[PDB]
Structures are given as C-alpha cells and as structure tokens.
Symmetry: C5
Subunit: 283 residues, 5 copies
C-alpha cells in the first residue's frame, strides 16, 4: 500500500516548536560531547586511542548532521495559516540521519571492540565484519525509507526493514561473541563495565527501529514529531551515555596497565574522584 | 487570558539598536569565555577536569545560541517606517535561549559539584538528580513560554511556570545539600570560595524567572528590550563570573593536592599573582 | 541641531573601494594577531597567562566584528549610478565597532595590569574599576552615536560624548595610578617597557574620540571614508602594536622569575634574538 | 561526436537521493579521517612527519571539495515534476573533484615516498617528478572532461584522456621504481606493508579512469549516479584505507628506530594492540 | 587613455572553468600550507618562532582571500548565452588579492629576516623599514589598479605602478643588504640556503608586476584568465615553495644551536631524512 513520508505532514506551531527544540538540543549536546572528547583525550593510553578516534568521529559527523537538519528545518517548512507546510527541503530534516548513522554505527562498533581483549589480525576480522554489518544495516534501511518507494511504500519499507534487521542480528552476534570472549580475559572491574556497555549499546540500537515502524504504521504531524523526539533523544543517550562508558573502561584499562608495568602514563588517572594510577616518566 | 508574545511587538530604532548591541555583546563575551577556558585548561588537575569540560560545554552552546539569535535578529525584523516589525524569525531571537539553558543549567550544576567533596557513586546519584531537575525546569518553562499556548496564554505561562519553579526548588535543594556536606570536608580557603560560588549561582538563577514574569505581565517593545537586556546581562555575569569562580576553586584544590602529595602538577599554580604550588615531575 | 549619520552618505567608487580595502585589511591583520597569540602563548609563564587570555579575547572579538562589518558592507551599499547608495544595513558597517570596543577596551586594561605589580584583592579592586570605567565609556558613546538620536542629533552626540569622556578620564587615572605604583617595584628594563606601553595605549585611545568628533562636525562620503580609515588604522596599530608590547614584558618578567628561582619555564626565552632565560625541568 | 556532460542529465528522486547520500557520506568519512589524522599525529616520529602532513592535506582538501559539492548539489537541481533538472550549478557537483585530485594525488605520492628509504636530494628528484606527473595527469584530465569541449566532446575526452594516461604511467613507474629500491633496505615487516600499500594505491588509482570512460560512453541519470557512487566509494577506500596503511608503516618505522637507538619517542607505539616500542626520555 | 578593467570582460565557458579551477586550486593549496605550518611548528626553536608566526599569518590571510574570491566568482558572473558576463561582484574576484598582499609581502619580509643574523634594535630598524616599504608598494599598486581611475585609466596605472616600483626597489635593497650582512655570519650550509631563499623571494616578487602590465596593455577574457593563472600560480610557488625554504633554514639553525649548546630542543631534527640534532631535556 501507499503511505505518507514523515516529511510530508503539516506541523502545528507546537509540533514545529518541539521539533526545533529537540533538533537544536541534540545538536548542542553533540557539540558538547565533541569538546569533552578532545578535552579528555589524554586520559587514555595509546593502547586505547582508537576509542578516542571513534568517539571523535561519531561526535563530529553527528554534529554536522544535526546542524544541517536544523537549517533544513528552518527552510523546509513555511507558516501557511496556523500550520507549517513541508517544502522539498523537509526530507532534509530526516534523511541526513542515515548518513550520520552510516558512519556512527560502524564507529560505535569499533569503539566497543577497542576496549575488548582482541589483538592482531583477530582485531581485524571482527572489526571488518562488524563495520560491514553495521553499514549494510543502515544502508538497507535508507533504501526502504528514503530511496526505493520514496518512503511512501509499505512493501518497500517492510522488505528493506527486514533486510536491515538481518544485518542487525549479524552485527549484534559478532559484537556479542567478541565481548563474551573478552570478558574472561579482562579484570573483574573492567569486565563488569564492558558487559554493561554492551547491553547499553545493543539496547540503544533497539530504539532506532521503532522510529522506522512508526513511518510504516502512522502518519501525521504528531507522528513526525514523535519520530524526531525519539531519534533525538536516542542520539543524546547513546552518543553521550555510551561514549562516556567506553572512556571509563579505557581509563580503567590504562590505569591497570600502568600498575602492571605494561606502560606508563603522563598524568594520574581519576575515575569518580578516586585515583586509579599515578603519573610516571619513561625510566 | 490571551497576551502578546515578546517576539510579537514592534521595536523602535532605539530598541532595535539596544537589542542588537546586547545580543552581540553577550555572544562576544561568551566567545572570549570559550577561549579563556581552553587557554587555562591546564591550570587544573585531572581530578578536577570535569569543571573544564562543563565550562567548555556551557561556553560553546551559549556562543552558538547567541550567534543564531543575532542572525535571526537581523532577519527577524523589517524596518517598516520608523519602527521594526517582527517577522516569523522573531521568535528565533528568544526561543534558542531555552535550548542553551537546557544544556547549560545542568552543566552548571555539574561544574559546581565538580569541586565539591563527593566521590564514587555518591557523585552519581546527586549528579543525575541535579541534571534531571535542571533540565526539567528549563523544559517545563519552554513549554509554557513557547509551545503550549504559543507564549500568548497567561494560564499556560502561569501553570508551566509553577511547574518549572518546583523543579527549581528541587535542583537547588539537591545542590545546596551537597555543598553543605562538602564544606566541612574542604579546607577553609576552598570552603569559603565554594560557599560564595553556590550563592552566586543560585542568585543568578533567580534573575531568569524575572524575564518570565515580564512576559506574563507586560507586553511592548520596551518590555521585549528589557527581557533581552536582563537575560543577556545575566548570561554574561553568570557564565563569566561563576565560571571564573569554579576555576579558582579547582586551581586551589589542585594546589592543595600537590602540596599534600595526592598528585603532582606540571606547572606552578598562581592565584591572584600568588604562587600556590610549584611545578613537579612524575616520580 | 540635526546631522546625517556616517552610514547615511553615498560613496563614490573610490570611497567604496578604500573602505572595503581597510575593512578587509584590518580584519586580516587581526586574524594574523589571533594566530600569533596562540602560537606564542607558551613563551610566557603562568603568572602572566592573563595577558594571553586578554589578548586572545581582543583578537577574537575584533576579528568577528570586522568580518561582520565586511559582509555588511558588501550588502549595505548598492551601486545606483556611479555612486553607492547606503541601504538600511549600512549602519551594520559602523555599529559593530562599539560591540567590539565594549569587550576590547576593558580587556586591554586587564592586559596592561596583568604585567604590573598588583596582587591579591588589590589587583581585583583596580581591575573591576577599570573594567567598569572602560565599558561605561564605550557604552555611553554608543548611546550618543547610535541609539539616542539615531546618530543624527548633535546635542545627543555632544552630551553622551562628554559623559563618555568623563569615564575615559576615570579609567585612565585608575590605570596610570596603578602603573605608577608598579614602576618602582619592577626591574628597570621591565619598568621602561611598561611606561612605554602605558603611553602607547593611552595615546591610541585618543584617536578613537576623533572619529566621534567627525561624526558631529562633518558629513559626507569623504568623511565616512575618513572615519573608516582612522578607526581601521587605529585598530591595527593598537591591537597589533600594544599587544606585542605586553607580550614582551610578560616574556621579560617570566625570564626574570626563572633567573630568580621564583619559577621554572619549559623553554628558553628569546627577546630580540637575545636569550633571556634557559629551559628548565620541574625540580 | 557531441555527447551529454554527466551534469546535464535529469535525475529521478531515487538517483537524486542516492547521490546526496554518497556525497554526504564521503564528506563525513573524510572529516572523520581528518580528525583521526590529528588525533594520531604523535604516534609517528619526526623522521616520518611528512606522512602526517600529506595525509592532513589530503583530508582537508577532500573534505572541502565534498562540502562544496554537497551544497552545489542542493542548489544545482530543481524538482521540476518527478525528475530533478540540472541547473548551471550542476557542474559544480562534479568539477570540484578535479581540484581536489590535483592536490591529493601529488600528496598521496608524497605520503608513499615518505615511508620509503630515499633520503637527501634523492628524495627530491623523485618527489618532484612524481608531484609533476601526478598533477599533470589530473590537469590534462580536467581539460578533456570539463574545459576543452565542455565535457561534451568525445574526441576531446579521448585525446586528453590518453594524455592523462601517459602521465599516469610515468608517475606510476617513478613511484614503483622508488619503492622497489626501498623494499630491500627496509625490514621485512615494513617492506611487506609497503609493497601492499603500493599495490593498494596503484589499484585505487585505476578506478578513477573508469568514471572517465563512462562519461565518454554512456549518458543518463543512471550513469551520472554511477559516476558519483564509483568516485565517492573510491575516495573513501583510498583516502581512509591507504592513509591508514601509511600510518602503520610510519609507526612501525618509528618503533624500529626507537629500538635501534636511532631516535627516542615520547609514547609507546602499539600496532594491533601489540607494543612495538616503549616510551623514552631525551637523554 | 581609457581601458577595460580585467573584471569587465566576458568569459567563455573554458575561461570561466579555468579560472574557477585555479582559484580553487590555489585556495586549497594554501589551506594545505596552513596545516603544514601548524603541524611542523615544533621543529623549530623559540629563537626562530617568528618564522612560524609569519608563515602562519601568510597562509591564513591568503586562504581567506581565495575563499572570498572563489565565492565572489560563483556570484560575479552570469551565464548569458554561451558567455559569462561580469556583474559588480566581478571586481571581488581580483581586488581581495591586494588585501592579501598588503599583509603577506610585509610578513614574507619578516619571515626572511627571521632566519638572518640581525638581533636587538638592529632587527627592528630593518624590520620596520621593510614592512613599510612592502606595504606601501602594494598600497600604491592598489590605488592605481582599483581606486584612482577605477582600473580603467592607463595614466593612473602607469603613475601608481611607477610609485609602487620605487618602493619595490627600496624594500628589495633593504632586504638584500640585510641578507648580505648575515651570510658571512651564518654557517656555510645555512648561508647557502639563505642566499637561495633570497633569490627565490625576489624572483617571485617579479612575477606579480607582470599581471599589472597586462592590465595596462591587454584587455579581454583571455587576458583576465591569464592574469588569474599567473597570480594563482605565483602564489602557490611562492607561498608554498619559499615558506618551505625558510622552515628548513630555521630547522637547520635550531639544530646548529642544539649542537653548540646555545639551546636544547625537545625533538630530534631531521632534514631530508638526515638527523641534524638529537632530542634533549632542559636540565
Ligand atoms: C539533555 C541534555 C543534558 C546534558 C547533560 C550533560 C552532562 C553529562 C555529561 C557529564 O560528563 C562528565 O565528563 C567528565 C569529564 O572529565 C567525567 O569525569 C571523569 O573524568 C574526570 C577527569 O579525569 C575525573 O576526575 C572523574 O573522576 C571522571 O568521572 C564525568 O564522569 C562525566 O559525568
Ligand atoms: C561587559 C564586558 C566585560 C569584559 C570583561 C572581561 C574580563 C573579565 C575576565 C578576566 O579573566 C581573568 O582571566 C585570568 C586567566 O589567567 C585570571 O587570572 C588567574 O589565572 C592566572 C593564570 O594562571 C594567574 O596568573 C592569576 O593569578 C589568576 O588571577 C583572572 O583571575 C581573571 O580575572
Ligand atoms: C599593514 C599590516 C602589516 C602587518 C605586518 C606584520 C607586523 C609585524 C608583526 C611581527 O610580529 C613578530 O612576532 C614575533 C613572534 O615570535 C616576535 O618575535 C619575538 O618572539 C620570538 C619567539 O620567541 C623571539 O625569537 C623574538 O626575539 C621576539 O622578537 C616579533 O617581535 C614580532 O615583531
Ligand atoms: C600543486 C599542488 C602540489 C602540492 C605538493 C606539495 C609538496 C610539498 C609538501 C610537503 O613538503 C615536505 O614537507 C615535509 C614536512 O615534514 C618536509 O620534511 C622535512 O621535515 C620532516 C619532519 O621533521 C623530516 O622528516 C624530513 O626529513 C624533512 O625533509 C619536506 O622537506 C617537504 O618537502
Ligand atoms: C562507509 C563508512 C565506514 C566508516 C568506517 C570507519 C572505521 C575505519 C577506521 C578505523 O580507524 C582506526 O583508527 C585507529 C586509530 O588509533 C587505529 O588503531 C591503531 O592505533 C592505535 C593507537 O595507537 C593502536 O592502539 C592500534 O593498535 C592501531 O591499530 C586502527 O587501526 C584503525 O582501524
Ligand atoms: C548514534 C546512532 C545510532 C546508534 C543509530 C542506530 C541505528 C540503528 C541501529 C538502525 C537500525 C534499523 C533497523 C534494524 C531496521 C531498519 C531501520 C533501521 C535502519 C532504523
Ligand atoms: C547560563 C544560563 C542560566 C543560568 C539559565 C537559568 C535559567 C533558569 C534558572 C530558569 C528558570 C525558570 C523558572 C524557575 C520558572 C520558569 C521560567 C524559567 C525557565 C526562566
Ligand atoms: C581596540 C579598540 C580600542 C582601543 C577602542 C577605544 C575606544 C575609545 C577609547 C573610545 C572613546 C570615546 C570617547 C572618549 C568619547 C565618545 C566616543 C568614544 C566612545 C569613541
Ligand atoms: C583521492 C583521489 C584520487 C586517488 C584520485 C585519482 C585520480 C586518478 C588517478 C585519475 C586519473 C585519470 C586518468 C588516468 C585518465 C583521465 C581521467 C583521470 C583524470 C580520471
Ligand atoms: C604571495 C604574494 C606576493 C609575494 C605578492 C607580491 C606582489 C608584488 C611584489 C607586487 C608588486 C607591484 C609592483 C612592484 C609594481 C606594480 C604594482 C604591484 C603592486 C603588482
Ligand atoms: C606563472 C608563475 C610562475 C611561478 C612564480 C615564479 C617563481 C620564481 C622562482 C625563482 C627561483 C629562483 C631560485 C634560484 C636559486 C639559485
């Protein structure tokens, strides 16, 4: 059957206002996250610098995405009467997300495996497979939701959604299997945090498919608002919450290495205002 | 009853000029603050780096808020005759503030608890509760003032204002209780500054609700100008004044740690052209 | 009587070209200055880091000001016939200066007292008084020249000019008294430079009031060009010249501290290709 | 014979969407790459800093290129009916690539020779010859494809394509001869990676000429989409893949130098979560 | 007699394309140069940091200039028929150069004297005289070519050109005399490079007056293209070539100081993959 794309529904002044708030809130929060990433990049050892690199990429891409979207929002809707009517630039308030997710979901997978105990070419097979799975899941989703059918075809939305879901399961299994292998080889305190962070990431990835089911099932300005709120909220929680969790595991692992003599760190490491390791100079 | 939103009043050339000055002054001052934050980030220990992270986020978000607003001012008012008439972009000269405050007030709470003596999961409960309270206070305010009623409904403004005030009291109590617990455990010199900084932040938070009462009670170009001046002024004083106070406490606490052997700092710490601690080398 | 605001005069192609050159030249020079400030920030001790902070703020705000003005120039004049006719945003080619000066003149006062021998709360008193005086001098000027009268009233220009001049004398006395107290307590070489820098700053502050007297006395495209040239030139000389002088005094004072054991500096200090102090390691 | 330039074909909503995705994806990935380059610049010794410099230039130029192109895409196609019709700004969605490649291909050659064993004036002859060849190959291509004939002449496309191909062979021979001389003088582990990286770069350079043959042979919206996808994909693989490979060789060579006493490095070097060298202090 | 300003000639699609390429190529190359300057700023001692400061300013200003010009090109010409017709924004594709040169030529003089053996107030007289001469040469040129006559008067072009040439000779003599005094006091290897760099800078300064003689003698789209190519090419060669040469002399001088005990450098210095000096610790 046919449906109306989320970007093809007229918004009341409330709905217009809420959407601008959330878009701008999310873009702001991600710019904070970018600063935080750069300001705390030296708390982690070079053995774990991939986590900083991934997180930096996530924050940059996502910040651009939201800037674009906020601007395309101001130019995608015009206040005809009491309602705001979508232009052609309305789709540019939703479509940039998939660009962002195409970079971010692969990078989030890398961030997670960064602090796991995989090394050498083993930390290459899993990394490629995850990156592949992650990108393919977003790309298949983009096809169903924006490209094939114009985001107005239920059958396209359902088919490509199912494809995207297969890749989800694949990526998720790969990651979870990798973590499950690492947990035994980490210290208890690290292993515990890494389990939590795996749960958080997977659980946060479950929210995004809900914004997809809405597009299939419900159309309206309420539902366009819902989608924006859900996705914006999810972004703040995942890209601020999860990226803080990985930094703490990287810090904790750095500190463990320092104590073990595996490496030396220029500054002391504090986690929760407790000193984990002291500063040291190359002997 | 029904009233006119601050952004729905025609400005005289004076009022237009004053508003552009203050908007631009505030945006400029916050960009100075951002530079100051980055240039002085290494004066503080890693045990207190959260203060610089919070302050950096505050300065960044607030700076883009004001940039947006300054641009939306130049495009939100058209010089019909001697007066400037508000367009649709007029609300974009006021609404972005709430986006900024939604990030900033939570971050200001974090900045304050950064230099208090809470640690571990204790420095997590309070931090989440404050962040929650702070965000909810701004968000409820945004609803009354921009969303529910279009900022033209007294009853909406009064109801959501009262809600926002409850969350204010909650956040304030949480913070003040946290500080009151820390003061005994700080050194006299730090405790004194931390008391002051708590008073300054709370006192500065009282000014913002006045701009809200104006919107309820008075409409006009004078009153739109008043609101802009009050809020701009408050921003400069709180986001420059308070953020300097927390940096001094962080520096003083760093210096105390250095003297106690709790940690080492690469550079000497000067506060008021008095040396607080010397530079040291890791082990 | 009534006059015509500087931004209300049609420019010949010469005058249009000269103004664009100077605006762009000044904006470029200030961007060079900003780079220079960041690139040389580590030549100075932490006891004098306020000088870098002030100078960084000056350069940033002034650079934005000129960017804004250059853009408002390209869009504020339309080539009707041989002449360029001012639009409504012609005033945006002159008004942003006062925003800049409102930040910069206070910051320049701070930069100067940074390298003087005032310490503790004594530094605070003088710093607040100067900052107050400086801002009030610019703000009163802005009122007379842009706000009260629309920059078309001689009596407003004369009254607010006189007010602004009182605050000038106040700020100048405060600063000069502070310097005169420091000179005895500095080393001869530093004292000499600090005297010079005081003369340079005060002397440079005398040029700006001339652009104000023009606006009162003469109107025309020649006179609008004169104002732009004078103010642009003054900005380059004061914000490049003076800010270099303070850096040399900060470097020289850093070097004196290093030699005295008051502090240690990571790199050697060179002034005029003469080594002032050697690099040292913390303890 | 007369043919239609890639930028002179109307795109279906699918093709429009795909192209925007890929353009934006590539621009995002290159901005990630730029961050990665800056964040990992200190993993390499100063003997190999040219690799970082080249890679930084590549990432910056390419990121600008894609930003320009993404913006020119939004303004180069107007949605007349179901199809998007190319404007005059359509050529600005394709032509900027050649600007980018004119910088990037020479820089990629430099990046490769950076980690080879050529030194002194020998590392000047080869470097100039390669830079010359590389630039001339792109420039001759630009002439055929954009300038001489307007990208609508088969004979121009064929002639300048053949010229560009001669320069390709020249550059490729120069590079390959340089590598083949270095491989024997490198350590096995480095030599192996350097062989691989040479194959990757040369192989990636083969993809770009395919987008050229399309322009000669096929015109259409499908083919304009194909060109964009091919070139975007190639950019991500070459500018992320290859630039990672050279960094690993630079890290490995740094680590070898550290172990040999040829130099000292401030931080330990990890490659694949295996420590290659320890951190050391100057003398 | 009267002539047509370079910006008053209609461009064929070829000429339009070539000009956009070169403008964009030059802007890109200068952005690479800016990155290179920042990435290699720590290879040089603090005794020679002026070279980095000058080079940074050059690259920044020149990059802005070209960005402005590239944008003014896209908006300065309208595709009437097969030809592109210049509007009022066409002059903004040529005039910004003189702003850039007004900063850059003085800065290039400073960069050169940075690595010569002048010190104290001696390194002040020459520096001011050169800066004066350099700026006056560009400014007099701007008058003849853009301001006095509108770039349409041969006699103005000839008179101001002759003035500009006098200042050229003055600056050149000052510089050459300074170098000729330094060469004897440098080490052979440095002296040789410094001679070369002097020749390169002076020789590159000779190219710019040719673009001026064209404007006097020839008008046309070919000739406006020629001017753009010549000036763009000259910029790449001088601003990238010369600024590399000065960095090598600064590195070599740093290394000589390190070996002599005049100073210590934190990193080893490599020039052409040959180690010039080792890394050292302050004490
Ligand atoms: C809706 C919008 C709401 C916005 C909320 C934003 C605030 C939440 C983010 C706070 O981010 C905060 O970053 C600092 C960075 O030093 C972290 O702090 C961490 O590193 C510092 C620095 O070494 C250590 O002293 C500390 O023990 C450790 O917790 C905090 O653990 C984290 O809570
Ligand atoms: C309306 C517009 C008004 C604009 C006013 C702007 C000026 C106010 C901000 C001045 O910000 C100033 O920053 C410097 C930063 O080193 C601080 O200086 C502090 O750190 C330095 C650096 O270690 C120490 O040498 C010094 O003892 C200490 O005071 C000042 O305490 C603070 O006052
Ligand atoms: C019309 C506008 C034209 C503007 C042209 C440029 C104006 C002159 C700017 C030169 O700026 C120059 O900066 C360098 C920065 O290292 C300063 O140099 C200073 O620091 C360096 C670095 O430690 C020392 O080696 C040196 O002894 C000391 O003089 C110069 O004293 C200053 O003259
Ligand atoms: C048309 C556009 C084409 C653009 C091509 C640009 C070519 C030059 C850019 C790279 O230029 C190159 O920079 C590196 C920067 O580390 C310099 O390299 C120098 O410093 C490094 C870093 O300490 C040393 O390892 C090396 O021995 C030394 O030569 C090269 O000497 C220079 O030739
Ligand atoms: C389509 C869009 C898909 C986007 C995919 C993007 C992800 C691929 C790039 C990942 O980039 C990743 O960067 C880190 C940077 O520390 C590298 O990691 C490297 O350096 C770190 C830091 O010293 C070492 O601990 C590690 O051993 C080494 O592998 C990874 O080798 C690389 O894989
Ligand atoms: C920071 C951004 C994140 C974590 C985005 C995640 C997005 C997904 C996990 C998307 C998954 C999808 C499906 C499984 C079904 C089809 C629709 C998608 C693309 C939303
Ligand atoms: C830097 C910005 C700051 C400190 C902003 C603070 C804003 C408040 C404390 C707002 C509080 C409000 C109420 C208590 C009542 C409703 C209106 C609000 C949102 C202004
Ligand atoms: C870098 C900018 C500087 C130093 C600006 C300084 C401006 C002044 C000192 C202005 C003073 C004025 C008066 C004393 C009279 C009224 C007019 C003013 C504002 C120009
Ligand atoms: C990162 C960008 C890269 C590596 C671009 C490479 C481009 C080429 C190798 C282009 C070569 C061409 C020919 C050999 C024939 C004519 C067409 C060209 C310019 C595409
Ligand atoms: C990177 C920019 C540089 C080096 C620019 C240099 C420009 C000149 C040396 C210009 C000189 C001129 C004359 C000597 C006479 C005619 C007018 C000028 C301005 C082109
Ligand atoms: C069309 C622009 C051409 C490039 C600008 C001119 C470059 C001249 C460089 C001369 C170098 C001479 C070096 C002599 C060494 C003995």
């Amino acid at each position: 059957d046919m449906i109306s794309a989320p970007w093809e529904a007229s918004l009341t002044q409330a709905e217009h206002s809420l959407i601008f708030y959330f878009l701008a809130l999310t873009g702001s929060a991600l710019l904070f996250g970018l600063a935080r990433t750069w300001l705390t990049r030296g708390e982690v050892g070079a053995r774990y610098r991939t986590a900083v690199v991934a997180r930096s990429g996530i924050m940059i891409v996502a910040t651009l995405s939201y800037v674009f979207m906020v601007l395309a929002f101001t130019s995608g809707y015009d206040h005809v009467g009491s309602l705001w009517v979508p232009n052609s630039e309305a789709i540019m308030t939703i479509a940039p997300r998939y660009v962002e997710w195409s970079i971010a979901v692969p990078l989030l997978s890398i961030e997670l495996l960064s602090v796991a105990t995989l090394s050498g070419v083993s930390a290459r097979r899993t990394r490629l497979a995850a990156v592949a799975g992650a990108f393919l899941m977003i790309f298949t989703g983009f096809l169903g939701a924006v490209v094939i059918g114009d985001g107005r075809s239920v059958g396209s939305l359902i088919i490509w959604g199912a494809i995207s879901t297969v890749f989800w399961i694949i990526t998720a299994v790969i990651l979870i299997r990798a973590i499950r292998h690492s947990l035994p080889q980490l210290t208890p305190e690290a292993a515990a945090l890494l389990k939590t962070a795996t749960i958080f990431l997977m659980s946060g990835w479950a929210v995004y498919p809900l914004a997809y089911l809405i597009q299939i099932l419900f159309a309206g300005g309420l539902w366009t608002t819902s989608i924006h709120i859900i996705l914006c909220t999810a972004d703040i929680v995942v890209k601020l919450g999860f990226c803080g969790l990985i930094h703490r595991i990287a810090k904790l692992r750095t500190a463990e290495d320092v104590r073990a003599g595996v490496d030396i760190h220029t500054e002391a490491i504090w986690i929760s205002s407790v000193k984990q390791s002291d500063a040291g100079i190359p002997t």
